[PDB]
Design a binder for this molecule. Sequence first.
Ligand SMILES: C[C@@H](O)C(=O)SCCNC(=O)CCNC(=O)[C@H](O)C(C)(C)COP(=O)(O)OP(=O)(O)OC[C@H]1O[C@@H](n2cnc3c(N)ncnc32)[C@H](O)[C@@H]1OP(=O)(O)O
Ligand SMILES: C[C@@H](O)C(=O)SCCNC(=O)CCNC(=O)[C@H](O)C(C)(C)COP(=O)(O)OP(=O)(O)OC[C@H]1O[C@@H](n2cnc3c(N)ncnc32)[C@H](O)[C@@H]1OP(=O)(O)O
Ligand SMILES: C[C@@H](O)C(=O)SCCNC(=O)CCNC(=O)[C@H](O)C(C)(C)COP(=O)(O)OP(=O)(O)OC[C@H]1O[C@@H](n2cnc3c(N)ncnc32)[C@H](O)[C@@H]1OP(=O)(O)O
Ligand SMILES: C[C@@H](O)C(=O)SCCNC(=O)CCNC(=O)[C@H](O)C(C)(C)COP(=O)(O)OP(=O)(O)OC[C@H]1O[C@@H](n2cnc3c(N)ncnc32)[C@H](O)[C@@H]1OP(=O)(O)O
Ligand SMILES: C[C@@H](O)C(=O)SCCNC(=O)CCNC(=O)[C@H](O)C(C)(C)COP(=O)(O)OP(=O)(O)OC[C@H]1O[C@@H](n2cnc3c(N)ncnc32)[C@H](O)[C@@H]1OP(=O)(O)O
Ligand SMILES: C[C@@H](O)C(=O)SCCNC(=O)CCNC(=O)[C@H](O)C(C)(C)COP(=O)(O)OP(=O)(O)OC[C@H]1O[C@@H](n2cnc3c(N)ncnc32)[C@H](O)[C@@H]1OP(=O)(O)O
Ligand SMILES: C[C@@H](O)C(=O)SCCNC(=O)CCNC(=O)[C@H](O)C(C)(C)COP(=O)(O)OP(=O)(O)OC[C@H]1O[C@@H](n2cnc3c(N)ncnc32)[C@H](O)[C@@H]1OP(=O)(O)O
Ligand SMILES: C[C@@H](O)C(=O)SCCNC(=O)CCNC(=O)[C@H](O)C(C)(C)COP(=O)(O)OP(=O)(O)OC[C@H]1O[C@@H](n2cnc3c(N)ncnc32)[C@H](O)[C@@H]1OP(=O)(O)O
Lengths: 162, 162, 162, 162, 162, 162, 162, 162
Amino acid sequence: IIEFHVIGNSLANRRVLLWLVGLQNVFSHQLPRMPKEYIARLVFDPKHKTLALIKDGRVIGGICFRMFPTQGFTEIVFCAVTSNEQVKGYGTHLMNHLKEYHIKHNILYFLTYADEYAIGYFKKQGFSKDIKVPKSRYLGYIKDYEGATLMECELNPRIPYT
Amino acid sequence: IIEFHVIGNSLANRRVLLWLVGLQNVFSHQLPRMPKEYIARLVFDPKHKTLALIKDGRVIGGICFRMFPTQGFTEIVFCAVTSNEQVKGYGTHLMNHLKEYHIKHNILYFLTYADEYAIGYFKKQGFSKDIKVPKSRYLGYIKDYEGATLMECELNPRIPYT
Amino acid sequence: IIEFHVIGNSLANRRVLLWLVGLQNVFSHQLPRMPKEYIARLVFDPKHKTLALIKDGRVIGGICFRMFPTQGFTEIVFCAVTSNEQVKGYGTHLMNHLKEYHIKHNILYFLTYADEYAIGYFKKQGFSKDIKVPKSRYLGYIKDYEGATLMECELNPRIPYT
Amino acid sequence: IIEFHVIGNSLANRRVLLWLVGLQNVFSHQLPRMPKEYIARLVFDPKHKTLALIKDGRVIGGICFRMFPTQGFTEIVFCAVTSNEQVKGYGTHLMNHLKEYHIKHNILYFLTYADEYAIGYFKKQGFSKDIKVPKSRYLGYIKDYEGATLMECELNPRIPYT
Amino acid sequence: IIEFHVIGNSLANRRVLLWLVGLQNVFSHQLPRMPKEYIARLVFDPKHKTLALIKDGRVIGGICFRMFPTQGFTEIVFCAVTSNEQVKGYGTHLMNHLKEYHIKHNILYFLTYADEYAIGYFKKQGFSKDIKVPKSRYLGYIKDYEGATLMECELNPRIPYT
Amino acid sequence: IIEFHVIGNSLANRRVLLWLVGLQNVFSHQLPRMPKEYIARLVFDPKHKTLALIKDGRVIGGICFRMFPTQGFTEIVFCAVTSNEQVKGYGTHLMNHLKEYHIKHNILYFLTYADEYAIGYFKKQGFSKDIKVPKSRYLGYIKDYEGATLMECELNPRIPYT
Amino acid sequence: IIEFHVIGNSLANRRVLLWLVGLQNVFSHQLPRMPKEYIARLVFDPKHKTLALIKDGRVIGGICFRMFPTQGFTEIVFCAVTSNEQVKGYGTHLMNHLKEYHIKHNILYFLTYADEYAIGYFKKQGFSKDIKVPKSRYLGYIKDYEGATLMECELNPRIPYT
Amino acid sequence: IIEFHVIGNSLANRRVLLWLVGLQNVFSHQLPRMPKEYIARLVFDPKHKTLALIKDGRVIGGICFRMFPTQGFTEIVFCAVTSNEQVKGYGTHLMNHLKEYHIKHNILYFLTYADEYAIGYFKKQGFSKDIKVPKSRYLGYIKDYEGATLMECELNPRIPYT
Ligand SMILES: C[C@@H](O)C(=O)SCCNC(=O)CCNC(=O)[C@H](O)C(C)(C)COP(=O)(O)OP(=O)(O)OC[C@H]1O[C@@H](n2cnc3c(N)ncnc32)[C@H](O)[C@@H]1OP(=O)(O)O
Ligand SMILES: C[C@@H](O)C(=O)SCCNC(=O)CCNC(=O)[C@H](O)C(C)(C)COP(=O)(O)OP(=O)(O)OC[C@H]1O[C@@H](n2cnc3c(N)ncnc32)[C@H](O)[C@@H]1OP(=O)(O)O
Ligand SMILES: C[C@@H](O)C(=O)SCCNC(=O)CCNC(=O)[C@H](O)C(C)(C)COP(=O)(O)OP(=O)(O)OC[C@H]1O[C@@H](n2cnc3c(N)ncnc32)[C@H](O)[C@@H]1OP(=O)(O)O
Ligand SMILES: C[C@@H](O)C(=O)SCCNC(=O)CCNC(=O)[C@H](O)C(C)(C)COP(=O)(O)OP(=O)(O)OC[C@H]1O[C@@H](n2cnc3c(N)ncnc32)[C@H](O)[C@@H]1OP(=O)(O)O
Ligand SMILES: C[C@@H](O)C(=O)SCCNC(=O)CCNC(=O)[C@H](O)C(C)(C)COP(=O)(O)OP(=O)(O)OC[C@H]1O[C@@H](n2cnc3c(N)ncnc32)[C@H](O)[C@@H]1OP(=O)(O)O
Ligand SMILES: C[C@@H](O)C(=O)SCCNC(=O)CCNC(=O)[C@H](O)C(C)(C)COP(=O)(O)OP(=O)(O)OC[C@H]1O[C@@H](n2cnc3c(N)ncnc32)[C@H](O)[C@@H]1OP(=O)(O)O
Ligand SMILES: C[C@@H](O)C(=O)SCCNC(=O)CCNC(=O)[C@H](O)C(C)(C)COP(=O)(O)OP(=O)(O)OC[C@H]1O[C@@H](n2cnc3c(N)ncnc32)[C@H](O)[C@@H]1OP(=O)(O)O
Ligand SMILES: C[C@@H](O)C(=O)SCCNC(=O)CCNC(=O)[C@H](O)C(C)(C)COP(=O)(O)OP(=O)(O)OC[C@H]1O[C@@H](n2cnc3c(N)ncnc32)[C@H](O)[C@@H]1OP(=O)(O)O
């Protein structure tokens, strides 16, 4: 019933392609201040990936992220769970799966910009406002959001998350 | 800078992909009573095409259609122009380009179902409630919408439309 | 553990082969007035497919059908669930999965010939004795059964069935 | 030694060639009011086939027919058994083999035009003057013979014929 | 018209496929205490062959067997003739054709496990309860049937059986 | 999420590799009187296979076995379930899956040597101290353990095990 | 009449080659203190690109830039519009197009050295003397100009520039 | 009798594969607080290498390390010598060989995290708690261990170590 797939636009077949459109749709509905062409541009950007959450063949949530292996971290671009399936643990399950996928790729730091509506969920996911990654390593790589709060999560590679 | 392109999923691909994502977004917003997943599935269906209206590199309108050359007609699936570009003649220019395209393919009949709000636009584009195409030729081919009005446009192949 | 597989003799696989034999066995036991070699011929006909119901690796039911995309409908040939798995919702889930599969293929009409003993099951699956598909479109394509009654089900492509 | 072969010109070829010459000769002699050139043109037509009755390596009878699978029927073009082999059941065995062949191809309707002398043979083979196939389905496909009688045979796919 | 074909699932053919299904049907009807899926698995096992008895194109009997050339014997798995063709010498002709086939392959011993109901048929086909093949050569190769009795037939390679 | 995979070194490979490393670790911990190097050499031996019990992507149990198809039996080399997953039926489900796998390969005899602590588990899985396979067939093929008890399981190919 | 092309010397055909010579000519005339062999070396350097401004097929302006994706910024090398076409908005249109091209490549920082004659135009283009890119990230990558003023423009990827 | 091989999982043959399993075994026994799946994941990670110490064909020690040539250093992941072969100089010989291998690859800095039980051996190997590699160069690349002590060894490329 529940699935997890790290998908993305390569160079993709139709089932993954419609999953990406669903992801772009959910991100738009759940993040109205983000321009939909901006969401669509990043979701289909080849350097971006999306951990998709599938229920009975249908997208119900996902995390869009940008891996920076040469810089040693991943940027969290979009997080969303559809309106009626929220407050059920799916958001935590998504982040946990993202953490397990990243320790398997030996990337141990997440960076993200959270506004006031979002900061609480990231704190529950283990993110902090104390940033260990040096500014010279993320500035110009992650996209800055003025007025938002930069937040960082450090992963433990000896711990299982799923 | 105004452009018209007949595009669609098959089997510039990345720019066609984002165009198809932009068309699915414009269609979904302008046709809110249509399911978004239904729109996406048809927009990316291999047997469906979309005439995209591109302005300065961005999607601002389109007509999704499904050609039935073995039956002698084309089904008009979705028509939409983004709100800020409406009442400028783009919907008329879109339909005229679609007519010229189908005359080149010896397809001279458009079929569609218009609800109470859209009937007036199709009337202004030459559509009629009198259907010359026999029911045995379109039933089970076009998608029926109960309580909507079946409309037909017959194209003149000797007339220029653009 | 229950799965749904649209299988059929191509040109195949041993796991698919033994499922087809199991389907031929179940159909024949549940339809004793059908000739076994007639069931075998259709189940193994390359133009026929069967949606197999697999519980714990073994066949327990299925629906054999013939798609007529150029005609706009699909003919339902055999429906059966093994006797010890009947009256559990398996026949209904089979029909619903078949409806979803045909929506993705833009075939929106089912036609079938029901016994006096099976006509009740088809009425519950939404079938009606009112046939919208013209006779000139199904006669000579679906297999006629003198004495039985033609039944038709129209599918809504904007609705999810599974 | 009795043999039945479905043969025909395309795109043992030399023995099939002489069989086709023998069939054209038998057809011409048994159907004297048919033009010989007309018989030869259809016997060697790529879209036409002939079920040849071979006895000890020699043609003694045949049924030339044209399959219309897109229309759901087959046109019976010529039927003949050489004089010395008539009234032995070969004409009945020929038609029965043709029926079994068409059931394997999901073609369950024969159409033909019988003059006053041939109607009786087709009646004994199950043909009828009542035509279930709609006129819109056969007009302009089968060759019409004015003042002859259109006859139809419906085949039962559950019955063995050989 | 009666023929003998040593067939079996290779790696096949549709005519061979439907014969195998017919054999699976006949074996199962004539051996009701055998699980159908067990019969199906062995009939379609690539190490198993079946000598099919074909009367007028359709299966009416057969013998399924497993050759063990490195062990020096063949195991007889299933023997059946359809009920309306029994008591006609068909089962005896099947056994004789099987014996001839194995002489050409230099396998001179048959082993089998006979019911109290079938043991009489095997005695008539020359089988004996005296087993010359050592236990160390058949145990773990032939399928044991607790309660049944092992029976053995030795073939003379200088004798014609058909 | 429970999975069963038959894996093994030869000639997903990296995930099979880590599975084989996980199996060697589980085997070594659960069988401390076995040399770790001996376990690793057999787990990675080309002629040895392992049925791996995967739970949520991680090895939690397995049966290492060596098939002797030319001799008619399989040697059970190592059986283990990790401590935290014991007494849940996994050892029984592992053996049942191994039995179903071997019936598909016409191997109907398991052989193993059980010490005083493991005899009871094999008894509950149908093994017996009475050995039907002749000594001439297994001596020098299975690895002997002096002062351990040779045990044999005979599988019924007509019974379902999963 | 007006065009925009991001061109450059690869490893270029003749129309682009003459565009590059025109660009080198305009940069020389508009930047007399820059050695012409230095301008020519950079314009034809493969790691450099030039956004060319074409009027009726003729180069009238351009920006030569060096992308440093691994460093997260682009260096602005040469900017010029021909003498008679200046003070018409072309310089702003060029920079805006450069910004749109760079947000599409996820590079969000421009760096440049402006002398006293040039600082005012860059201030109107959104450049600032407050430099957010760390010195350790641009020193040795961009070419230093003593006495000139380092200037930086940060791009917003959610804003359209053309 | 004594050997040294820099081995690792590529994309490895069986002798190297069993050496890697032995290395994973020794690291587990000698570092019990390190999860064995974590040790196995890193030892078989393609970006990791292990300098293996072989005595008479058997693994008796090794250093697992991660080269970061783009960062200018190597991370020391696991060091171990089997229990009975310790305090014999093998640990120093291993590190010396690692140093010689790294000056040949022009990497002149080692970084590692040592707990209280390990700090003394690294001090004897020339490691120091004064860290010359800037934090911006190793943070997020080497795996941090809270409570452990970061330690650094600088190599001299003009000195022979073996
Ligand atoms: C800014 C941008 O550029 C980025 O970087 S990405 C954009 C991020 N923008 C959004 O995503 C907005 C739309 N939102 C959603 O789509 C979903 O809302 C979530 C956020 C995906 C949660 O997914 P979800 O609802 O499945 O979460 P789940 O069920 O795991 O529970 C969550 C546990 O966090 C607690 N909590 C505290 N504060 C919040 C909060 N603000 N939102 C949600 N939960 C919160 C809650 O109270 C429970 O904690 P508990 O009840 O256990 O104490
Ligand atoms: C399957 C089936 O469901 C479909 O296929 S979904 C198609 C229906 N999709 C929508 O409903 C989406 C929301 N809508 C729009 O996206 C745009 O509205 C349009 C419809 C694309 C017009 O495009 P547009 O605004 O560019 O039109 P354009 O400027 O060419 O002028 C058009 C001339 O028709 C006059 N007119 C009269 N009645 C209507 C009417 N109901 N709607 C629009 N115009 C109308 C108008 O007043 C002017 O009249 P004129 O000035 O010529 O006398
Ligand atoms: C057209 C022709 O060539 C074919 O293709 S052969 C089709 C007919 N194939 C057979 O004859 C084979 C033998 N049979 C079976 O293999 C099974 O019988 C089912 C039905 C095929 C499997 O379905 P199943 O047993 O899993 O049923 P499921 O539980 O899903 O639905 C149960 C709900 O159907 C209601 N109902 C009403 N009338 C009937 C009826 N006549 N038979 C069964 N249920 C009926 C019942 O009153 C309940 O209604 P509810 O409980 O909802 O109130
Ligand atoms: C496009 C359209 O123009 C055509 O497609 S051209 C087809 C017409 N081509 C000819 O006309 C050629 C000359 N003819 C022949 O080549 C042979 O004559 C036949 C027609 C091939 C019979 O073959 P055949 O002689 O082997 O027949 P067979 O032995 O199977 O028996 C048949 C049973 O039908 C009885 N019967 C009743 N009325 C007739 C009749 N008019 N003709 C033949 N039999 C007839 C017969 O008395 C026996 O009756 P039963 O004994 O069963 O009661
Ligand atoms: C080992 C096991 O895993 C297997 O592989 S399953 C083998 C057993 N499969 C069945 O049970 C299926 C159901 N059965 C059949 O499908 C058919 O029954 C036959 C026999 C398989 C076909 O053979 P058939 O019927 O064509 O017989 P045919 O006419 O050739 O020989 C007839 C001569 O057998 C004499 N006779 C003595 N005892 C028996 C006996 N028990 N049954 C039949 N005949 C017997 C009879 O008295 C006459 O003797 P005669 O007339 O010579 O004096
Ligand atoms: C070459 C030769 O050396 C080998 O091949 S090495 C194989 C021996 N490898 C070990 O020794 C490793 C340590 N052990 C384990 O890794 C697990 O222990 C098991 C053995 C994998 C059971 O797996 P498991 O714990 O999942 O078993 P599962 O839950 O299926 O139940 C099993 C039912 O057998 C009952 N039972 C009675 N006696 C024993 C016994 N001695 N051991 C286990 N169960 C036993 C139990 O009480 C329950 O009885 P029930 O509840 O059915 O009445
Ligand atoms: C240093 C080097 O290593 C680099 O890094 S690259 C080398 C840069 N060296 C040159 O390029 C010298 C030659 N120059 C030209 O080739 C053209 O002159 C431009 C600069 C390409 C403008 O192109 P253009 O003339 O098309 O500009 P446009 O029409 O967009 O107007 C421009 C708006 O900036 C206002 N403005 C303020 N100060 C200046 C200024 N110094 N120059 C031009 N405009 C200026 C103006 O007053 C209007 O502002 P407004 O009037 O609206 O307030
Ligand atoms: C933390 C982790 O994430 C890492 O980063 S890796 C994990 C490191 N964790 C271990 O490896 C624990 C298990 N351990 C071993 O597997 C072996 O124990 C060694 C460490 C490989 C030595 O190998 P080895 O025994 O062959 O050493 P060798 O014979 O060269 O002598 C060594 C010379 O260091 C002196 N010494 C002082 N303190 C220590 C100490 N703590 N351990 C060993 N020697 C020490 C000793 O007294 C003699 O010095 P001397 O006697 O000459 O003054």
